[PDB]
């Protein structure tokens, strides 16, 4: 094991210490070749999306029912800048030389990219939570622009506060994890419970009380657009409104479900790709770990969860 | 909804004067509601403006002279007009906006003269 003390320990595979090898980690040398190009390549375009729409919205008589979208650019905007360490500095100090080689917990070479991404990544989906609940306020309620500021506090502070709580509970006796040559360091890519329990229940919680509000929203609007019949000029007017919540709304529950299906799809995965390494190590190398999707699948997981934030610009272009 | 009343301004105010403006067909929360002239000329003017409690915006060349309120229950928006000189000859127009869904109400019949 190339790893016998953290120079917890270090002690990822069922052991005092270990680590998995860094290079032809999980994955054929060759995709990791072209996932070289394709990570930034549609990393960094998304990034250069979605920045446009925080630089319009530092530039209509108040922005406070529509607010949570602003920071939801920002968190997402965040996360494509620190995915582009894919091959921003090429170098990959974040699988240390031969030093926490594999990925260090508890030292600096790691740490300084996780409590951004992990952070950042959570916060984008309850800022879209909360501002589904922003929309179902002043649709199924009788309430105003000001007078749903004046939870702003509030909003803040679960939004902020949920993501820095899931990153106060990953210390030393909690999981700070690595990253492939293709990765920046994040949370659960080598541990299933880190995954499993950390990671994709938060998502999935925060897509059902999505869904259940956001329908709970666009259908109580629904008895409105017919069934009160005295100015008419607002159907296909107010259409524009309740097609653009649908088109933003698809447009992100797509992602989030994608990548939950990646993720459960790794949940009954990993324990094979264990399994058959008491078949593939002790030596280089149930009966194949992985296959076509060595990149169909673990490809579209990045690319789902970086372009979760491209809703932003069909948001911003449908208003002017 | 607007109310006329009007005599012909004063017929040159007399100690003072008011319009008001109240809605009654409404579904979503009335943000800003304010009123408008128009000379009669080629615009129709911002008066002042007020949002559900507050930034009371008035004319950026007649601040300071008039007054605005609002009642909440009754979506009744009001504005006196002291010290009256001709040149607010014009044909009011109450105005209501919902701001998210973008869709303005406008009243009509109310016309001051002198």
């Known amino acids: 094991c190339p790893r016998e003390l953290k120079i917890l320990g270090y002690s990822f595979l069922h052991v005092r210490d270990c680590s998995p090898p860094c290079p032809n980690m999980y994955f054929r040398r060759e995709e990791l070749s072209f996932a070289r190009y394709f990570i930034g390549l549609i990393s960094i375009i998304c990034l250069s999306a979605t920045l446009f729409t925080f630089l319009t919205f530092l530039i209509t008589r108040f922005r406070y029912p529509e607010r949570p979208i602003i920071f939801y650019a920002v968190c997402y905007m965040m996360v494509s800048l620190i995915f582009f360490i894919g091959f921003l500095l090429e170098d990959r100090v974040a699988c240390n030389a031969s030093s926490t080689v594999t990925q260090g917990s508890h030292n600096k070479a790691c740490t300084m990219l996780f409590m951004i991404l992990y952070f950042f990544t959570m916060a984008g989906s309850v800022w879209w939570v909360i501002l589904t609940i922003t929309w179902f306020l002043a649709a199924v309620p009788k309430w105003g622009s000001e007078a749903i500021e004046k939870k702003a506090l509030l909003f803040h502070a679960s939004a902020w506060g949920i993501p820095g709580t899931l990153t106060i509970i990953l210390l030393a006796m909690n999981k700070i994890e690595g990253d492939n040559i293709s990765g920046v360091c994040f949370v659960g890519l080598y541990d299933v419970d880190a995954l499993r329990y950390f990671v994709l229940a938060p998502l999935c919680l925060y897509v059902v009380v999505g869904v259940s509000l956001l329908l709970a929203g666009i259908i109580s609007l629904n008895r409105v657009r017919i069934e009160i019949p005295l100015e008419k000029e607002n159907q296909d007017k107010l259409v524009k409104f309740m097609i653009r919540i649908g088109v933003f709304s698809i447009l992100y529950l797509v992602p989030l479900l994608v990548v939950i299906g990646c993720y459960f799809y790794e949940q009954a995965y990993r324990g094979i790709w264990e399994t058959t390494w008491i078949q593939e190590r002790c030596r280089e190398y149930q009966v194949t770990q992985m296959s076509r999707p060595d990149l169909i699948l673990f490809l579209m997981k990045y690319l789902m969860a970086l372009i979760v934030g491209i809703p932003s610009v069909f948001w911003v272009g449908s208003k002017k | 909804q607007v109310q006329l009343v009007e005599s012909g301004g004063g017929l040159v105010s007399g100690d003072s004067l008011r319009l008001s403006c109240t809605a009654s067909?409404?579904?979503?929360?009335?943000?800003?509601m304010g009123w408008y002239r128009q000379a009669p000329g080629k615009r129709r003017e911002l008066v002042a403006d007020?949002?559900?409690?507050?930034?009371?915006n008035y004319a950026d060349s007649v601040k300071g002279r008039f007054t605005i309120s609002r009642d909440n229950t009754k979506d009744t928006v009001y504005l006196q007009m002291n010290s009256l000189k001709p040149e607010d000859t014009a044909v009011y127009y109450c105005?209501?906006?919902?701001?998210?869904?973008?869709?303005?109400?406008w009243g009509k019949g109310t016309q001051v003269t002198v």
């Open positions: 007020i949002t559900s409690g507050g930034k009371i």
């Open positions: 067909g409404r579904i979503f929360n009335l943000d800003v």
């Open positions: 105005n209501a906006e919902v701001e998210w869904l973008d869709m303005d109400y």
